[PDB]
């Protein structure tokens, strides 16, 4: 299909996720053919801690360059859990060491908190974690 | 108010009132082992004293606690505020000094003075052995000033039995257990304080209990004006009430009413 083999996963051609955006969606989706199919191969034993662990190699790749930001809305359009879960997690890891300044730098966000509100909504957080 | 700031605490059930005054280095929890030996036939009164670790350091007024006298103003203030006409008084060891003064100052108010690890001055004189040689005492100050001048300017003070311990480390060990400025302040009011020309002015009867190996006993036995039993314990130590309390519990019950 356009912006056909093994596109079964999504909630089975539509301009919303256009070619640039949907291109990526195919990369990860047919990489999960290896994950499904390598269970069927090869010899009786295992050989089965490369999906559970080592398949996450290219999961933690493939997310060089957001937006991306619009890939979440594409992974939302197509109701595909394991891809949303993946990119939504990798946005998490951006919001970690970032101070509330550094968050709204690398996520273009308008600081609107009046210092009236702000340090009271802060004093909310001194009632946890200790 | 003073009763709050100085954590006074009354515990047992009885008519006879027992006052338990801790030493300098410690606080009132030094008495926690001994307390229940007497807590069932006595109203036991305890206080933390202003220079102890567990009192706020803000109540240390540095241009007030310059001599032993204001420590005594506190003791008598406490007693008056609880409204105690008479009590027996266990004091160790600067708080023995404080007890002696308070009983000269107010002999109505004490059944008996029981003074653990008492000496009237700790600066051993050319005559005679009542305390520690000034060479040693000097070394103890020499260690606390390091700690004070570490404490500002924000550095860790690390002076403990980095010392010399003639008879001195065990004594001075506990002194370090306060805020270093206050340690130094109350450490000097310990060694400059002499009250051996006040002993024969003591009317109320006194039992000294002394920690183990002419020496001291025979001096203060003759010189105290009250009736003067001097018992000595079996085992050494600054704090017979923490080490060895089952024993000190006995000498205490034996030196009462």
């Amino acid at each position: 299909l356009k912006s056909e083999a093994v596109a079964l996963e999504s909630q089975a051609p539509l301009p919303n996720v256009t070619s640039k955006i949907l291109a990526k969606v195919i990369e990860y989706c047919k990489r999960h053919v290896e994950a499904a199919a390598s269970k069927a191969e090869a010899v009786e034993g295992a050989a089965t801690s490369d999906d559970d662990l080592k398949a996450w190699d290219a999961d933690f790749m493939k997310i060089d360059q957001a937006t991306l930001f619009e890939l979440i809305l594409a992974a939302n359009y197509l109701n595909i859990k394991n891809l949303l879960d993946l990119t939504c997690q990798t946005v998490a890891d951006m919001i970690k060491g970032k101070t509330p300044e550094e968050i709204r730098t690398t996520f273009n966000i308008k600081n609107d908190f009046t210092p009236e509100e702000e340090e009271e909504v802060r004093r909310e957080n001194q009632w946890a974690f200790e | 108010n003073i009763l709050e700031a100085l954590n006074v605490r009354v515990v047992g059930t009885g008519d006879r009132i027992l006052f338990l005054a801790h030493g300098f280095g410690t606080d009132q929890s030094a008495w926690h082992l001994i307390l229940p030996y007497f807590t069932q036939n006595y109203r036991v009164v305890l206080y933390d004293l202003v220079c102890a670790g567990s009192v706020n350091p803000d109540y240390f007024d540095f241009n007030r606690y310059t001599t032993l006298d204001p420590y005594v103003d506190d003791l008598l203030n406490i007693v008056d505020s609880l409204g105690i006409q008479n009590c027996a008084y266990v004091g160790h060891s600067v708080s023995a000094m404080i007890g002696i003064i308070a009983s000269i100052r107010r002999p109505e108010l004490f059944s008996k003075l029981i003074l653990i690890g008492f000496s009237p001055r700790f600066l051993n004189d050319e005559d005679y052995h009542g305390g520690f040689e000034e060479g040693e005492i000097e070394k103890v100050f020499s260690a606390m000033e390091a700690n004070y001048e570490a404490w500002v300017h924000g550095f860790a003070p690390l002076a403990v039995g980095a010392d010399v311990p003639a008879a001195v480390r065990e004594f001075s060990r506990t002194l370090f257990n306060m805020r270093p400025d206050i340690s130094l302040f109350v450490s000097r009011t310990v060694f400059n304080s002499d009250l051996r020309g006040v002993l024969g002015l003591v009317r109320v009867p006194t039992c000294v209990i002394q920690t183990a190996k002419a020496s001291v006993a025979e001096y203060l036995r003759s010189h105290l004006g009250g009736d003067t039993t001097v018992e000595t314990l079996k085992t050494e130590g600054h704090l017979p009430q923490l080490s060895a309390p089952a024993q000190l519990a006995q000498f205490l019950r034996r030196a009462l009413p």
């Binding site: 939302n76 509330p100 702000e118 | 690390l158 060990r173 506990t174």
Partner: protein, 615 residues
């Protein structure tokens, strides 16, 4: 910038310091949308909420797990009877702030803390954890402590007594006499503060019987043969036959042949087919184990995680004995006098996912078969070799094979993927030599644990200007979580006899590096114990040196101190979480003035702690 599907991004956060920045110290589009659904179900709070809990839109509707056990002051009984509107006023607003709590943890000094907390969450409440290091109230019924839960809270599936001190008889009574509730359980930890000499057979057998549906049971039991009432071959059977739905069973003999034989164990494992996770950890031993271990694989196919105590001859030499057992994800053999180079070699045929091996106190096993294993199993990532392994003494740091990959390491005394390291020093032993010129270089080491045992009173006076080289850990550059546990080091506290020396030396000796670990960010300091008093408390040097760790946000002292020594830590500029956590049985004051500390003091200290400007 999308909406409202940020709550799925936000929910994989998970660090609690980050969720505070974005959002509640940042912009609106998260500072309601985080405090609403995405709170990640967890909040362990700080201050007495029977003081000025004044808030308004402080509501967490998807909050599942709440933790009122670190609530301060730390020991104190929370809203019990020794007026109930003061309690119920607080319980209401705790329900208001967090409804839909499924999982609770509290510090249950007496049962009424429970009768006054639960009935709001009565319907939602699945797991409960009780915490009590203090003496039991000595006059309760004695099913008493557990009663309020089993009667009111009718969805109670899980129960975590791991750190709730009890008599063994409270557990017996409460669990055997609420059949409807007790026969609905699935998870049970009866390690009662590690205080009891274990559960007896007469005690254990009927607890199992009263809980037919149970999947995880974790407990200490009395194993010594010389008793009429040990857990043995029959008792284990009656455990298994009374609740076979067990997937996880962990069973440890406490301490300071015998009555379990392969005969019985085979009959035992035969009754428990669902067994995944199994541990028997005893001092008294099982003799030929091989036949019993085979049966474990034969009868429990799912068996993966297993750790065995004193269990002799698990595996002999060729052919296949403990190795019959296919699926072991993680194995820890614990006390074997018969586990040889040969046996290590072989169980290379258990590299299903041996991701964890461990040898504790197994002497005839050489530094060498070890190389064997890390070779043959090359996805083996945490390991542990310990306290009396005679041949391996940091020669077996110099074992290489898995230094590319081992994610954790434990040992008594590049590495390019060490996350977590755990040392066991003794007495006054030095750190730097036997670790850092042993083998040194760990560019991802974050957490490090140090334990020291014991008896300084019979040590030499660490040569003037000696140290425990905490400073030589400054090399490791993502090392942000420390845990220096001197607790089991006994000493003289405020007054040592003549010739001996007090602990402030030993605290110095130990703590004297930590200024230099600039990566440091979370310290857990257990100070040492004086033979006979049960307050562990800091001395001058300790507070002075800990004060200098300028980059800690969290500091936790498993002991106490007085108010003079408390204020040292306010100097630490961004230090935020600070508590005295006396989590050891028996834990002692305040209704008694037993230690240097007073709650008056710490409640005051805690104001100055979050009345400074902190990031």
């Amino acid at each position: 910038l999308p909406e409202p599907l940020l709550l799925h991004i936000l929910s994989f956060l998970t660090d609690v310091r980050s969720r505070h920045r974005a959002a509640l110290a940042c912009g609106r589009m998260r500072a309601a949308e985080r405090a609403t659904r995405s709170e990640l179900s967890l909040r362990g709070d700080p201050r007495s909420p029977g003081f000025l809990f004044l808030s308004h839109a402080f509501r967490f509707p998807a909050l599942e797990h709440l933790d009122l056990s670190l609530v301060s002051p730390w020991g104190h009984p929370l809203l019990s009877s020794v007026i109930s509107e003061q309690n119920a006023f607080i319980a209401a607003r705790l329900a208001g702030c967090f409804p839909a709590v499924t999982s609770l943890a509290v510090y249950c000094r007496d049962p009424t803390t429970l009768a006054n907390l639960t009935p709001h969450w009565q319907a939602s409440l699945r797991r409960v954890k009780l915490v009590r290091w203090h003496q039991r109230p000595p006059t309760l019924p004695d099913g008493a402590d557990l009663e309020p839960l089993l009667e009111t809270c009718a969805a109670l599936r899980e129960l975590d007594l791991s750190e709730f001190y009890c008599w063994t008889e409270d557990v017996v009574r409460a669990l055997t006499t609420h059949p409807s509730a007790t026969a609905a359980l699935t998870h049970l930890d009866l390690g009662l503060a590690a205080a009891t000499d274990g559960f007896k057979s007469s005690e254990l057998g009927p607890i199992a019987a009263s809980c037919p549906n149970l999947r995880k049971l974790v407990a200490p039991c009395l194993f010594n043969p010389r008793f009429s009432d040990c857990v043995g071959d029959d008792a284990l059977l009656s455990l298994a036959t009374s609740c076979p739905r067990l997937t996880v069973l962990r069973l440890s003999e406490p301490f300071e042949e015998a009555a379990i034989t392969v005969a019985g164990l085979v009959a035992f494992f035969a009754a428990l087919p669902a067994l995944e996770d199994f541990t028997m950890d005893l001092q008294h031993n099982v003799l030929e184990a091989a036949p019993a271990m085979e049966a474990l694989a034969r009868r429990c196919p799912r068996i993966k995680f297993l750790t065995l105590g004193s269990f002799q001859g698990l595996c002999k030499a060729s052919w296949l004995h403990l190795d019959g057992v296919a699926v072991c994800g993680g194995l820890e053999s614990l006390y074997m006098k018969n586990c040889q180079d040969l046996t290590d070699a072989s169980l290379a045929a258990i590299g299903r996912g041996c991701r964890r091996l461990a040898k504790f106190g197994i002497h005839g096993c050489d530094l060498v078969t070890s190389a064997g294993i890390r070779r043959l199993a090359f996805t083996l990532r945490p390991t542990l070799k310990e306290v009396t392994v005679l041949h391996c003494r940091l020669l077996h740091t110099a074992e290489c094979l898995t230094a590319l990959s081992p994610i954790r390491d434990r040992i008594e005394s590049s590495w390019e993927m060490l996350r977590s390291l755990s040392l066991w020093f003794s007495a006054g032993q030095l750190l730097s030599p036997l670790i850092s010129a042993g083998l040194d270089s760990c560019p991802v080491l974050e957490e490090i644990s140090i334990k020291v045992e014991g008896d300084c009173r019979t040590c030499p006076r660490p040569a003037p200007r000696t140290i425990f080289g905490l400073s030589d850990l400054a090399g490791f550059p993502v090392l942000a979580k420390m845990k220096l546990d001197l607790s089991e080091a006994v000493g003289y506290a405020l007054t040592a006899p003549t010739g001996q020396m007090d602990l402030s030396l030993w605290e110095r000796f130990y703590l004297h590096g930590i200024e230099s670990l600039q990566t440091l960010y979370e310290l857990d300091y257990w100070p040492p114990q004086d033979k006979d008093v049960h307050h562990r408390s800091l001395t001058l040097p300790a507070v002075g040196l800990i004060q200098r760790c300028v980059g800690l946000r969290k500091l936790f002292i498993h002991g106490t101190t007085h108010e003079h020594f408390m204020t040292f830590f306010l100097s630490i500029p961004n230090l935020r979480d600070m508590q005295l956590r006396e989590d050891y049985y028996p834990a002692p004051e305040n209704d008694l003035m037993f230690t240097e500390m007073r709650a008056e003091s710490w409640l005051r200290f805690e104001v100055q702690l979050n009345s400074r400007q902190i990031d």
